[PDB]
């Protein structure tokens, strides 16, 4: 059973969320299997950011067991701004564990592959949900290949009706257009340029997505075994894979206990709707 352990108050520099298996911390990057059911291509998604929130929370590559923490820029907490007509993030936003976009192999981010989960229920930070892949988009975020897998929680009431990317157009009309717009404009309020998509913004289909996911997983297989070119930056401690160099069961025990803190308030500025 997967739960979460929260250190500190939400919306602070000290905030951290660890994933626990049966009460013990494990690595959110390395220890959650990519597949919940490999035969039927059911994936485990680590959720970072709930739909309709702003705080830019991410699995941290550089800290032990890769807790989810808030991104910062020059010491200041990062929040995505509200870009009309959107409110914060428009998907449950996360990553697949045991994936790595190797920045030495080419057509690369050095991060796990990103996942947009489009189901009805709002997710929680640190949630491990089981999803099926529907398709994939290729954003060029600031000079780099930034895949966005489109997926759905298998528990969603619509899940059996969605198998491939065309089903998103059918049941969620306008969501793909919104996704294109969102990723184009979301950093404009931060003073950054409009982003661009490859494939003229087309969402490639499920087969294409599975190909990309499998290839980011193989790379990761060699990261954690230690045979990769350069795991610089990235911390590779894990506690579930007994025959890896960086297996360190003690890492679990070194994590502080759950702090019991109410969410810190968020600056009223974050309310603002930007018309861009």
Q: Is 121 in the site for a copy of itself (CB under 8 A)?
A: yes
**Mask of contacts with a copy of itself, 175-204, x by CB under 8 A?**
x--x--------------------------
What is the dihedral angle through the alpha carbons of 32, 60, 77, 183, rounded to the nearest 10 degrees? -70
Check binding of 141 to Mg ion (CB under 5 A): yes
**202 near Mg ion, judged by CB under 5 A:** no
Is 89 designated active site? Answer: yes
The answer to whether the CB of 276 falls within 8 A of the CB of 64 is no
DSSP 87-155: -S-SSEEEE-TT----TTS----SSPPEEEE--SS---TT-EEEEEEEEEEEEE-SSSEEEEEEEEETT
**With the C-alpha atoms ordered 21, 25, 29, 30, is the resulting torsion angle positive or negative?**
negative
The stretch among 171-179, 187-195, 199-207, 213-221 that binds a copy of itself (CB under 8 A) is: 171-179
Nearer to a copy of itself, 38 or 87 (CB): 87
Q: Quick one: 22 exposed, middle or buried, by C-beta within 10 A (0-12, 13-18, 19+)?
A: exposed
Distance CA 159, CA 207 (A): 17
Q: Does residue 268 touch a copy of itself according to CB under 8 A?
A: yes
**Contact yes or no for 97/32 (Cβ under 8 A):** yes
Q: Please work out the total of residues on this chain that contact a copy of itself, with binding judged by CB under 8 A.
A: 21
Q: Does 63 bind Mg ion (CB under 5 A)?
A: no
Q: Does 275 bind a copy of itself (CB under 8 A)?
A: yes
Binding test (CB under 5 A) with Mg ion, winner from 111, 153, 156, 235: 111
Nearer to a copy of itself, 67 or 88 (CB): 88
Secondary structure string (H, E, C) spanning 174-218: CHHHHHHHHHHHCCHHHCCCCCEECHHHCCECHHHHHHHHHHHHH
Q: Is the peptide bond before 274 cis (omega within 30 degrees of 0)?
A: no
Stretch 55-94: interaction string toward a copy of itself, x if CB under 8 A? -----------------------------xxxx--x----
Establish if 124 lies at the interface with a copy of itself (CB under 8 A): no
**Contact characters 18-57, a copy of itself, x per CB under 8 A:** ---------------------------------xx-----
Question: Which among 89, 93, 124, 247 is annotated as catalytic?
Answer: 89
The residues, ordered by sequence, that sit 6+ positions from 66 with a Cβ below 8 Å of its Cβ are 27, 28, 29, 30, 59, 60, 235
Q: Which stretch binds a copy of itself (CB under 8 A): 57-65, 166-174, 210-218, 251-259?
A: 166-174
Residue 109 interacts with, from Mg ion, a copy of itself, none (CB under 5-8 Å by kind): Mg ion
Return the active site residues. Answer: 89
Chain contacts with a copy of itself (rule: CB under 8 A): 51-52, 84-87, 90, 120-122, 171-175, 178, 268, 271-273, 275
């Amino acid at each position: 059973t997967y739960t979460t352990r929260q250190i500190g108050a939400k919306n602070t520099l000290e905030y951290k969320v660890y994933i626990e298996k049966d009460g013990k911390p494990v690595s959110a990057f390395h220890d959650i299997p990519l597949y919940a059911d490999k035969e039927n291509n059911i994936f485990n998604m680590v959720v970072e950011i709930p739909r309709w929130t702003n705080a830019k929370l991410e699995i941290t590559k550089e800290e032990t067991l890769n807790p989810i923490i808030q991104d910062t820029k020059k010491g200041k907490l990062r929040f995505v701004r509200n870009c009309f007509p959107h409110h914060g993030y428009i998907h449950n936003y996360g990553a697949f564990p045991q994936t790595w976009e190797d920045p030495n192999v080419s057509h690369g981010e050095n991060d796990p592959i990103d996942v947009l989960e489009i189901g009805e229920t709002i997710a929680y930070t640190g949630q491990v949900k089981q999803v099926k892949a529907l398709g994939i988009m290729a954003l060029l975020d600031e000079g780099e290949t930034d895949w966005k897998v489109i997926a759905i929680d298998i528990n969603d009431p619509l899940a059996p009706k969605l198998n491939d990317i065309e089903d998103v157009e059918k049941y969620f009309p306008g969501l793909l257009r919104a996704t294109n717009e969102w990723f184009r404009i979301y950093k404009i309020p931060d003073g950054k340029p409009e982003n661009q998509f490859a494939f003229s913004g087309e969402a490639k289909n499920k087969k294409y997505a599975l190909d990309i996911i499998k290839e980011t997983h193989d790379s990761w297989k060699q990261l954690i075994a230690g045979k990769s070119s350069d795991s610089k930056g990235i911390d590779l401690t894990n506690v579930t894979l007994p025959d890896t160099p960086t297996y360190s069961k003690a890492a679990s025990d070194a994590i502080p206990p759950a702090s019991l803190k109410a969410d810190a308030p968020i600056d009223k500025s974050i309310d603002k709707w930007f018309f861009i």
